[PDB]
Structure formats: structure tokens, C-alpha cells
Curated annotation (Swiss-Prot):
The UvrABC repair system catalyzes the recognition and processing of DNA lesions. UvrC both incises the 5' and 3' sides of the lesion. The N-terminal half is responsible for the 3' incision and the C-terminal half is responsible for the 5' incision. Belongs to the UvrC family. Interacts with UvrB in an incision complex. It is found in: Cytoplasm. It comes from Escherichia coli O157:H7. The lineage of its organism: Bacteria, Pseudomonadati, Pseudomonadota, Gammaproteobacteria, Enterobacterales. This is UvrABC system protein C. It comes from the Bacteria.
Amino acid sequence: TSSLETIEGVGPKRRQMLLKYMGGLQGLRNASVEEIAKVPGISQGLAEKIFWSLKH
């Protein structure tokens, strides 16, 4: 239900950023908030948002 993929600042590419950062969703799936929290704004809010996306 969480619009994590279309967060108030995600959906266009922000998420992809991670891959623009890693170049592979897998890595993003392997990257929890800990890693995801290394992108634009994506520190905790987005980070988590993404975490719950691929992580678990």
C-alpha cells in the first residue's frame, strides 16, 4: 500500500537513482536502508521507502 515506488519524491527515477548509483536493482535489493541511504535525500525516509521495496 505504501507508495514507496511513487513516494512524494519517487516514481520518475529517484528510485532508479539507486541503480544510477549501483547500476543494478539487485544491488538495491541487496542494499538496505543502510546502502539506499546514500542517494539524493534518500537517507532514511526514502531509504526506508526503498528498503521496504526490495529488501523486505
